Structures are given as C-alpha cells and as structure tokens.
Amino acid sequence: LPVGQWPVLTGGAVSLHSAGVTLSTQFTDFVSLNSLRFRFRLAVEEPHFKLTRTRLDRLYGLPAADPNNGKEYYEIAGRFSLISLVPSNDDYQTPIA
Amino acid sequence: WGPGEINDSTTVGPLLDGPYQPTTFNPPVDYWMLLAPTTPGVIVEGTNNTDRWLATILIEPNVQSENRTYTIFGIQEQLTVSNTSQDQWKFIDVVKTTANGSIGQYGPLLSSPKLYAVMKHNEKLYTYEGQTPNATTAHYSTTNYDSVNMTAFCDFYIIPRSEESKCTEYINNGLANEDIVISKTSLWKEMQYNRDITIRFKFANTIIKSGGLGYKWSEISFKPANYQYTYTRDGEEVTAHTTCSVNGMNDFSFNGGYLPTDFVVSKFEVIKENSYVYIDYWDDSQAFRNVVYVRSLAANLNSVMCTGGSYNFSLPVGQWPVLTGGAVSLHSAGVTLSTQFTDFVSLNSLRFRFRLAVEEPHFKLTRTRLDRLYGLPAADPNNGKEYYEIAGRFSLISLVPSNDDYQTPIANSVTVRQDLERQLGELREEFNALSQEIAMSQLIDLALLPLDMFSMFSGI
Amino acid sequence: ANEDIVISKTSLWKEMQYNRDITIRFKFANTIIKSGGLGYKWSEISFKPANYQYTYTRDGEEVTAHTTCSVNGMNDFSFNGGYLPTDFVVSKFEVIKENSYVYIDYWDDSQAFRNVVYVRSLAANLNSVMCTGGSYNFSLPVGQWPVLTGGAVSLHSAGVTLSTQFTDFVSLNSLRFRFRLAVEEPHF
Amino acid sequence: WGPGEINDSTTVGPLLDGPYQPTTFNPPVDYWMLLAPTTPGVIVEGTN
C-alpha cells in the first residue's frame, strides 16, 4: 500500500481430480492441433486462506494470489486409453496418420 | 506511524560575543578584538613590552593641526593632533619601543562608525590603516609579534577571524452545521492484551556551546533520541525504533562572569516534578497495530534510579569543573496517545509519560557559588554507561474491529465426505433373505399390472 | 506476558461526517519574568497559556467554547546593550518566526464535541489572516522604554491531534489544534 | 475536557545574577551591594 502496513494474502490450497475427457481443438502460434480436453473437478484442502490485517478468515478454495506458488509447474501422472479407427482397403497397409 | 512532533527551540548565539568589561587581554588566535571607543584619547594600550608600545589615540574631527596632551602609559606627552577629514575621527596609531620612546604616528584612520579589529596572524600584528570603508590591514612586525597584551579602558568584543568581513562592515559602517451517514454500521468487540515490556533507554543530548572561549554554552539540551532495540515480546524479539525526550524541565542559567574567562551558560537544565519523560516505541506488531481506538492502557513498570555523570568542559585556561553526587528516579505514568492528521491519515504518536523524582545525593558542582542543586544533568545523563533496563508488564484494552465468524457463505465449510454405498455381497444376502415373507396371490395380482418409468421410482 | 483476553461481546457503530464551520479569534498574554536586577536585565519573556471562555451562534446555536491557547516551537533571541543594570539586557527574547507552533484547545459540552471520541478523520479549513506585531511599551526602573513595531504573521495548517491521558480509569481529554505561523512583511 | 498538559519546558530566572567585573556602581534602594574583594587596597570609594 502507498502507506501503512501491507496486507498478506496467504494460504491457498486445492486438489484437482479426474472426471472424464473428450476431444477439442487447441491453437498453435502457427497451426491447429488435434488436442485432447481433460476436464477436472475440484476439492478443498485443509490449509486455509487468510486475509491478514483485514476482516476475512476461514476461507477455502483457490485464490488468484500466486497459484504458481513458485512451483515451476504442476504435474499429473496417469494413463489414457484411445480406441481409434483407421481406413485400410484390406487387412494390412495400415496408415500412421 | 513514526516519531511525532516534539517542539524545540534553536541554540541561540552559538558564536556571538559582545562587550567585555575592561580587563587585561590579548587578541585571541583567529579572534579579532573589536573595540567600543568612548571618548577621544588613548583608547587601547597594546604592549609587546619588548618592541611594541602601541597607543591608538582617538582624535575628534575638525581638528587638523594641534599639539595636545595625551595620556600614554600614564604620562602626559605633547603629540601632534590632526585629522585627514573634517567629518571622520582620525585614529593616530602611536608606536614606541619604550613608555616614552620615539612617537611614531601611523595612519590615517578615518572611521565613521569608529570600529576596528585587532589580531595577529603568522607572527605579524594586523592594524587597520587608511580611511573607511577602505581600512587596509597594515602590519606591525617586531620581535615577539604575537605577544601584544592590550590593557583595556573600553568595552571589547570577540569576533572570529572568519567573521572578519563583518568586522570590515563594522569598520566600514558599523552594526453549515451538517452531518450525514458515511458508511453503514460495523460490529466491534473489546479485548485486552498483556505485554511484559522491557525498556532499554539511553537518552541523548545536544550539548552545544555559545561564544567566549568555549566557556559559554548556549543549549546543553536533550533531544528526541532514536535507536532500535529488540525485545523478546512473548519470547519473540519485536524490534522497536526508540525515540525519547523530556518536557517540562526547569530552565536555569549559569553565570560565572562577563569576560571570556568565566562561565556564561545560556540555558542549563535542572529537573523537578514539573516535567515528564516522553517516550515511544515504533514496532509493527498485531497487538500493537491495534493501538487504534484503544480504551485504556496500564504501564505497570518498576521504578528506575536514573543517575547522570559529568561533562568535561573546553577550557583553554586551566581545567574545568566536575559534577559530584545526585540522582533522580523514574516511574511509569499516564500514557498519552496523540493523533496527527495528514489529509486522509493519522500519524501515530504514543507519548509515554515517566514522572521524575529527584533524590539524594545532591548534584554538587565544584568551584561554584550556588548551594543545594538538584536534578539530573544534561551534562552526562548516562555517565558513559549503558541504557537503563526495566522489566514490567503492560495492559492494552482496546475495541478491535473483528468480524468473528459471520458475513460469510453459509455453505463455506470444509466438505465432509460421502457415505460408502452398501457393498454388493451383503446386499445379495439381504435381498435373498427378504424372499421369506413374500405372498403369492398378491404377487400374481401385481405381476398382471403393468408398471412404468414414473411408476418405478415414485414409490421410494 | 503472553495472554490475550476479550472483554465485551457484539456492539454497533456507524461512520458519521461533520462539515460545520466555526469562527475563531485570538488575543494573548506575556509572562515578563524579570531578573534580580533593576529591570533593564530581562531574565525571561515567555507566554502565559491564554484561557478564556467564548460563546458563538452556530447557525442559530449559541455554544460556549472554553478556549485555552499556547505556543510551542519557536526561534529565540537575546539582546544585550550590556550586562549592567541600566543599559538594556535581554537574556532571552522570543521572536515569533516561521517555525512557531500554536496549540488551541476548545472545551465544549456540545454534542459534536461530545461526539468526538474515536475520530476516523478530522480536518480544519483555516485561512492565513494577517496578524502583525503589537505595540507593547516596557517597564523600567529608570527613564523611558523601547517600543515594538512591525512584523506580520499568517496562519497555516499544522494538523490536528486527539490526545488521551490514561492516568487511571480516568480519561483526561485534551485536543490540540496545531498551527504553523509563516512570516510576512512589514519587518519587525 | 479542560486539561491540556503540554508545556514542553519550565522557565526559571536568576535573582543573585552571578558575579560582576569592577565598575562604579552603587547599591540601588532595596538593592544591597555585597562587596567580594579579591585584591588588597581600596574596595569602595563614596565619591561626591
């Protein structure tokens, strides 16, 4: 703040969980992409948000303060299963794209 | 927030000296001795006693050729009396090597304000010669140059060599009814806090000397002293920018004489119960930050014996006196929170009052005429020692603004989890069990009836 | 030590502005403390906290402010035609200068001045009115007295201070109206 | 309301007013002249 003590927007905790998937179409700086769309639901997590020197405590969710939290990224390690069709005039000569 | 306003005057006349009652002196190093000529005649007799027997003699204008009796060194001698003007006074400089040596007349010296300076630099005596405003410092140079003792008959001023320019000037010319809701209401609540505060305070002074020979001292005064210290508040060192002063002190005056060889203390400080020590911390701590709109405060502290030491004084002639004995004591007293307003904001000033009670011994000053002196000195309140330390508790009862639990989503809560649906197996067993009480006739009747989607679920 | 205790439960407050204009006026008074001499040797010349009680129609509302004025912050001077009891000796004379600070204390039973406990904000629109030096004539054991002439001063906002003295459960209520005083010609 | 306890100093003036250098000064009426001599010889001459 231009004067006085600065507030702290501290905390922030959530969890992302899997609830299905479909297909979508992202965009590249130059091209289109056959992109996959993973849709996720949320869950609150114990460590509260606190709004210091100010009138709110006992909040849960994700604030927009620093969602990167210095964490250069977040990761989800899992498996994905695709049953795809491919056009062949016979039982061989299978394409690759 | 931050140290508030403690109004203070300025040191008055730190380098200014004035008339000196006639006493035997010499031009002090880098200090012109201005004169106050009173009557026509020998004004100043500055003798080297070896080769310089100067006798500067005042001469009235309109007289340019006479033979007059001049009292030089106590002897009446017939001297040629003249002027180089009909409006200015001539100062014929009579130089001799004895009490009646060769009367050497020097000049001319025409000064309308009749002011001149005497000094001696680089083993050479500076004597003004010529007519004002162009009195050039001619040089008298004889063995033992800087040994001119001037026996005085007029009043003498001391002016530094650097202020010689001013000397030249003195040589040249002389000296409605509305109220409307702003914000909707808000809930507040009252809470008291407890803080075992430590107090480590070394109080600083502004010892400053006025003119003379270091013997004159303008303002030997304390000041708002700032430090920063670390106090294990709750076992937790909170840092405090510390500011200190005292107000209400008894302002006295010391006077040993009017010459440049006896004390002239412009304003000395003596303490009684007319004063309070005013003190403040500048920490940044939640319970502190709640100082806003306090209900009350209790500075429950232990009394402290505060004693001071002495100052050592710059005396180019002989040593300087010293203080002996004396004490005062401090007691935590009524807290005073002042709220300064800058156009949208309030500067904090938590002026803390400590009452002072003087106590034995007496503050005895060697080589003095005044008896029964009290009060800690501005000379050396710390004796070179360290800050006074006090461990005492403090109560902080205040009306905090704090929304306890409300004004929040009534669904906002850490979500308890689901209930795990009853497993297949016991489900199988229990449905197999229910087969017992089945009637037949009713079963066939029901089985003839056709149900439907709506008639599937609208019975549970 | 390390303990925190709540005293009272829920309670209500609301924010209120007041934009109300009130005239002010001033005279003063000087403590002429002589020394042990004839009178020419002036020990000290200070100000006596000037206390009156004035009463003013505030939009058809006559309210009496008990007024106490004081001055803190100043540059001091001294003058000495000598240090003997017949030529004039001023060991100290305060000369009003730009660094001069003034405290004004209003005492009002008025609901407004009643209302003022926990100030959220407080400002005062205070113009610079032309006040020059007086014409005081001195009192001496022999002969005549000097005379004062000239020296003007204008008024400037130096802030406002609310102050609470918690000696005990008794709450001494002082409000200090701070004033800077810039200097303008004529010369004094 | 009424107590304003800010007087940043207390003012005291002398009455004995310290020593003097020798000058032809008489005791004013109700102003004693105390003679502190530091040299032998004549101290006071009442001249009329």
GROMACS .gro file of C-alpha atoms in nm, chain B residues 169-446:
model
  278
  266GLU     CA    1   3.145   4.616   0.781
  267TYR     CA    2   3.164   4.729   1.143
  268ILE     CA    3   3.482   4.905   1.035
  269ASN     CA    4   3.314   5.040   0.721
  270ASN     CA    5   2.969   5.135   0.853
  271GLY     CA    6   2.909   4.966   1.190
  272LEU     CA    7   2.638   4.731   1.306
  273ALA     CA    8  -2.311   2.454   0.764
  274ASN     CA    9  -2.381   2.253   1.080
  275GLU     CA   10  -2.430   1.930   0.886
  276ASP     CA   11  -2.378   1.558   0.941
  277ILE     CA   12  -2.472   1.271   0.710
  278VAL     CA   13  -2.416   0.895   0.720
  279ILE     CA   14  -2.093   0.790   0.551
  280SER     CA   15  -2.075   0.414   0.598
  281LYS     CA   16  -2.319   0.155   0.723
  282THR     CA   17  -2.269   0.009   1.070
  283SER     CA   18  -2.000  -0.240   1.170
  284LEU     CA   19  -1.953  -0.472   1.466
  285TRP     CA   20  -1.658  -0.427   1.703
  286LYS     CA   21  -1.553  -0.604   2.023
  287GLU     CA   22  -1.340  -0.533   2.328
  288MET     CA   23  -1.025  -0.729   2.408
  289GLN     CA   24  -0.731  -0.675   2.642
  290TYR     CA   25  -0.374  -0.780   2.572
  291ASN     CA   26  -0.080  -0.831   2.805
  292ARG     CA   27   0.279  -0.747   2.721
  293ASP     CA   28   0.575  -0.785   2.954
  294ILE     CA   29   0.769  -0.494   2.806
  295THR     CA   30   1.138  -0.432   2.859
  296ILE     CA   31   1.264  -0.075   2.840
  297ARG     CA   32   1.630  -0.017   2.747
  298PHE     CA   33   1.683   0.358   2.713
  299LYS     CA   34   1.994   0.570   2.675
  300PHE     CA   35   1.887   0.932   2.644
  301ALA     CA   36   2.089   1.159   2.417
  302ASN     CA   37   2.176   1.527   2.447
  303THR     CA   38   2.259   1.820   2.221
  304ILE     CA   39   2.542   1.974   2.427
  305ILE     CA   40   2.625   2.290   2.231
  306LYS     CA   41   2.846   2.582   2.332
  307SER     CA   42   2.796   2.953   2.278
  308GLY     CA   43   3.079   3.200   2.232
  309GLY     CA   44   3.360   3.332   2.452
  310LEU     CA   45   3.643   3.076   2.482
  311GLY     CA   46   3.441   2.755   2.491
  312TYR     CA   47   3.332   2.872   2.834
  313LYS     CA   48   2.999   2.999   2.705
  314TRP     CA   49   2.745   2.728   2.627
  315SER     CA   50   2.418   2.803   2.452
  316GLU     CA   51   2.196   2.494   2.478
  317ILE     CA   52   2.310   2.190   2.674
  318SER     CA   53   1.987   2.009   2.596
  319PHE     CA   54   1.849   1.663   2.538
  320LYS     CA   55   1.671   1.577   2.218
  321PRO     CA   56   1.447   1.313   2.063
  322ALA     CA   57   1.694   1.025   2.065
  323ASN     CA   58   1.632   0.739   1.822
  324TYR     CA   59   1.768   0.386   1.826
  325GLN     CA   60   1.634   0.042   1.753
  326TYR     CA   61   1.624  -0.240   2.005
  327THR     CA   62   1.495  -0.596   2.021
  328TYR     CA   63   1.253  -0.703   2.293
  329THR     CA   64   1.160  -1.069   2.334
  330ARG     CA   65   0.789  -0.992   2.344
  331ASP     CA   66   0.632  -1.333   2.415
  332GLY     CA   67   0.983  -1.473   2.376
  333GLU     CA   68   0.977  -1.303   2.037
  334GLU     CA   69   1.212  -1.018   1.962
  335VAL     CA   70   0.997  -0.736   1.831
  336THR     CA   71   1.218  -0.455   1.706
  337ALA     CA   72   1.131  -0.104   1.821
  338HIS     CA   73   1.258   0.219   1.676
  339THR     CA   74   1.303   0.405   2.002
  340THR     CA   75   1.251   0.779   2.040
  341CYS     CA   76   1.298   0.968   2.365
  342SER     CA   77   1.270   1.319   2.509
  343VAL     CA   78   1.169   1.506   2.824
  344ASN     CA   79   0.936   1.804   2.854
  345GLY     CA   80   0.854   2.047   3.132
  346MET     CA   81   1.212   2.076   3.255
  347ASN     CA   82   1.324   2.369   3.468
  348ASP     CA   83   1.540   2.604   3.261
  349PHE     CA   84   1.809   2.776   3.467
  350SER     CA   85   2.105   2.998   3.383
  351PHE     CA   86   2.469   2.973   3.488
  352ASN     CA   87   2.690   3.283   3.509
  353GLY     CA   88   3.048   3.299   3.634
  354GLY     CA   89   3.147   3.630   3.471
  355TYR     CA   90   3.118   3.852   3.162
  356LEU     CA   91   3.478   3.829   3.037
  357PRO     CA   92   3.592   3.541   2.810
  358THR     CA   93   3.745   3.373   3.118
  359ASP     CA   94   3.436   3.291   3.333
  360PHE     CA   95   3.134   3.075   3.256
  361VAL     CA   96   2.827   3.201   3.070
  362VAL     CA   97   2.589   2.907   3.022
  363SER     CA   98   2.293   3.043   2.828
  364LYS     CA   99   2.043   2.773   2.928
  365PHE     CA  100   2.125   2.498   3.176
  366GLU     CA  101   1.876   2.224   3.260
  367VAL     CA  102   1.751   2.134   3.609
  368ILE     CA  103   1.482   1.872   3.663
  369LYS     CA  104   1.195   1.873   3.911
  370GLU     CA  105   0.848   1.719   3.923
  371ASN     CA  106   0.730   1.983   3.677
  372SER     CA  107   0.842   1.757   3.391
  373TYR     CA  108   0.766   1.421   3.230
  374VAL     CA  109   0.989   1.199   3.022
  375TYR     CA  110   0.806   1.139   2.694
  376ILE     CA  111   0.895   0.811   2.528
  377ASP     CA  112   0.787   0.592   2.237
  378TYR     CA  113   0.849   0.261   2.062
  379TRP     CA  114   0.796   0.200   1.692
  380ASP     CA  115   0.735  -0.171   1.649
  381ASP     CA  116   0.498  -0.327   1.397
  382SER     CA  117   0.306  -0.600   1.581
  383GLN     CA  118  -0.057  -0.705   1.560
  384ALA     CA  119  -0.147  -0.631   1.921
  385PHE     CA  120   0.040  -0.304   1.886
  386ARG     CA  121  -0.120  -0.224   1.549
  387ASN     CA  122  -0.447  -0.245   1.740
  388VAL     CA  123  -0.341   0.068   1.933
  389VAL     CA  124  -0.601   0.242   1.716
  390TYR     CA  125  -0.901   0.348   1.925
  391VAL     CA  126  -0.773   0.197   2.249
  392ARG     CA  127  -0.997   0.202   2.552
  393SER     CA  128  -0.715   0.214   2.806
  394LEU     CA  129  -0.357   0.122   2.889
  395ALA     CA  130  -0.161   0.029   3.201
  396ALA     CA  131   0.217   0.075   3.210
  397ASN     CA  132   0.287  -0.134   3.519
  398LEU     CA  133   0.662  -0.084   3.540
  399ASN     CA  134   0.930  -0.091   3.810
  400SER     CA  135   1.075   0.241   3.925
  401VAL     CA  136   1.426   0.316   3.799
  402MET     CA  137   1.705   0.505   3.971
  403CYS     CA  138   1.839   0.731   3.696
  404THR     CA  139   2.171   0.897   3.770
  405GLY     CA  140   2.395   1.104   3.546
  406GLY     CA  141   2.764   1.177   3.503
  407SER     CA  142   2.953   1.498   3.432
  408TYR     CA  143   3.057   1.685   3.120
  409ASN     CA  144   3.417   1.791   3.068
  410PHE     CA  145   3.444   2.149   2.952
  411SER     CA  146   3.675   2.302   2.690
  412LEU     CA  147   3.874   2.548   2.893
  413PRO     CA  148   4.183   2.690   2.718
  414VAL     CA  149   4.268   2.843   3.057
  415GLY     CA  150   4.304   2.579   3.327
  416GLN     CA  151   4.092   2.271   3.381
  417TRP     CA  152   3.713   2.250   3.409
  418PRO     CA  153   3.475   2.167   3.696
  419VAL     CA  154   3.304   1.833   3.759
  420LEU     CA  155   2.970   1.715   3.896
  421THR     CA  156   2.950   1.510   4.214
  422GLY     CA  157   2.650   1.332   4.361
  423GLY     CA  158   2.287   1.346   4.261
  424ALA     CA  159   2.010   1.112   4.148
  425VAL     CA  160   1.655   1.110   4.014
  426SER     CA  161   1.404   0.827   3.974
  427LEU     CA  162   1.152   0.747   3.703
  428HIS     CA  163   0.805   0.598   3.742
  429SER     CA  164   0.573   0.485   3.465
  430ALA     CA  165   0.290   0.737   3.439
  431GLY     CA  166  -0.007   0.840   3.225
  432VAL     CA  167   0.010   0.729   2.862
  433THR     CA  168  -0.071   0.999   2.607
  434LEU     CA  169  -0.166   0.896   2.254
  435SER     CA  170  -0.164   1.184   2.007
  436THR     CA  171  -0.317   1.153   1.662
  437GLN     CA  172  -0.178   1.374   1.385
  438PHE     CA  173  -0.388   1.417   1.071
  439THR     CA  174  -0.245   1.433   0.719
  440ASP     CA  175  -0.545   1.494   0.497
  441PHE     CA  176  -0.658   1.131   0.500
  442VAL     CA  177  -0.426   0.970   0.750
  443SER     CA  178  -0.327   0.974   1.118
  444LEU     CA  179   0.038   0.980   1.219
  445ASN     CA  180   0.069   0.791   1.547
  446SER     CA  181   0.248   0.938   1.848
  447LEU     CA  182   0.244   0.722   2.161
  448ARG     CA  183   0.397   0.973   2.403
  449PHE     CA  184   0.477   0.775   2.716
  450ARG     CA  185   0.499   0.966   3.044
  451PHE     CA  186   0.754   0.884   3.312
  452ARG     CA  187   0.741   1.100   3.622
  453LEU     CA  188   1.069   1.212   3.775
  454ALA     CA  189   1.150   1.248   4.144
  455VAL     CA  190   1.487   1.396   4.240
  456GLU     CA  191   1.669   1.222   4.524
  457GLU     CA  192   1.996   1.234   4.715
  458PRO     CA  193   2.283   1.283   4.668
  459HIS     CA  194   2.292   1.646   4.562
  460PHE     CA  195   2.433   1.742   4.225
  461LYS     CA  196   2.744   1.917   4.357
  462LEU     CA  197   2.938   2.132   4.110
  463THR     CA  198   3.298   2.209   4.206
  464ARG     CA  199   3.411   2.573   4.213
  465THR     CA  200   3.057   2.714   4.225
  466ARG     CA  201   2.870   2.971   4.434
  467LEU     CA  202   2.524   2.809   4.431
  468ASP     CA  203   2.423   2.564   4.703
  469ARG     CA  204   2.157   2.291   4.708
  470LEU     CA  205   2.131   2.197   4.340
  471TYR     CA  206   1.912   1.906   4.228
  472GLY     CA  207   1.803   1.730   3.911
  473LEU     CA  208   1.987   1.506   3.669
  474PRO     CA  209   2.218   1.696   3.433
  475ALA     CA  210   2.221   1.745   3.060
  476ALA     CA  211   2.598   1.710   3.100
  477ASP     CA  212   2.624   1.331   3.107
  478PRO     CA  213   2.296   1.156   3.199
  479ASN     CA  214   2.447   0.816   3.112
  480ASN     CA  215   2.791   0.853   3.280
  481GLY     CA  216   2.925   0.685   2.966
  482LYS     CA  217   2.739   0.375   3.083
  483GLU     CA  218   2.456   0.193   2.908
  484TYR     CA  219   2.080   0.234   2.876
  485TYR     CA  220   1.852   0.182   3.177
  486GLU     CA  221   1.670  -0.153   3.159
  487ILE     CA  222   1.322  -0.204   3.307
  488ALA     CA  223   1.111  -0.522   3.301
  489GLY     CA  224   0.744  -0.451   3.363
  490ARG     CA  225   0.405  -0.552   3.237
  491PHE     CA  226   0.159  -0.355   3.025
  492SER     CA  227  -0.215  -0.392   2.971
  493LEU     CA  228  -0.371  -0.297   2.636
  494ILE     CA  229  -0.753  -0.288   2.647
  495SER     CA  230  -0.899  -0.190   2.311
  496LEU     CA  231  -1.208  -0.214   2.090
  497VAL     CA  232  -1.084  -0.421   1.797
  498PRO     CA  233  -1.273  -0.439   1.470
  499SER     CA  234  -1.315  -0.808   1.401
  500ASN     CA  235  -1.591  -0.999   1.223
  501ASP     CA  236  -1.593  -1.309   1.447
  502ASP     CA  237  -1.745  -1.567   1.208
  503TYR     CA  238  -2.025  -1.406   1.009
  504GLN     CA  239  -2.072  -1.226   0.676
  505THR     CA  240  -1.955  -1.541   0.502
  506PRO     CA  241  -2.110  -1.805   0.278
  507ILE     CA  242  -2.334  -2.028   0.487
  508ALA     CA  243  -2.217  -2.315   0.265
  509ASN     CA  244  -1.847  -2.228   0.310
  510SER     CA  245  -1.708  -2.520   0.509
  511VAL     CA  246  -1.456  -2.797   0.470
  512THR     CA  247  -1.664  -3.061   0.297
  513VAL     CA  248  -1.719  -3.381   0.491
  514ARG     CA  249  -1.716  -3.684   0.267
  515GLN     CA  250  -1.975  -3.916   0.120
  516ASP     CA  251  -2.117  -4.236   0.260
  517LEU     CA  252  -1.981  -4.554   0.104
  518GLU     CA  253  -2.268  -4.736  -0.066
  519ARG     CA  254  -2.353  -5.074   0.085
  520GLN     CA  255  -2.144  -5.348  -0.075
  521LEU     CA  256  -2.282  -5.594  -0.331
  522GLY     CA  257  -2.238  -5.905  -0.119
  523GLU     CA  258  -2.436  -5.833   0.194
  524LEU     CA  259  -2.683  -5.672  -0.044
  525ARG     CA  260  -2.719  -6.007  -0.219
  526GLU     CA  261  -2.760  -6.189   0.112
  527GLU     CA  262  -3.023  -5.949   0.247
  528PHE     CA  263  -3.236  -5.947  -0.068
  529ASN     CA  264  -3.216  -6.326  -0.072
  530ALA     CA  265  -3.335  -6.307   0.288
  531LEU     CA  266  -3.637  -6.088   0.213
  532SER     CA  267  -3.772  -6.370  -0.005
  533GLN     CA  268  -3.931  -6.521   0.306
  534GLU     CA  269  -4.237  -6.303   0.371
  535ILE     CA  270  -4.344  -6.300   0.006
  536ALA     CA  271  -4.713  -6.367  -0.053
  537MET     CA  272  -4.825  -6.539  -0.373
  538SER     CA  273  -5.180  -6.424  -0.454
  539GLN     CA  274  -5.079  -6.061  -0.421
  540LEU     CA  275  -4.769  -6.135  -0.628
  541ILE     CA  276  -4.965  -6.267  -0.924
  542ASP     CA  277  -5.211  -5.979  -0.899
  543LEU     CA  278  -4.929  -5.725  -0.903
   0.00000   0.00000   0.00000
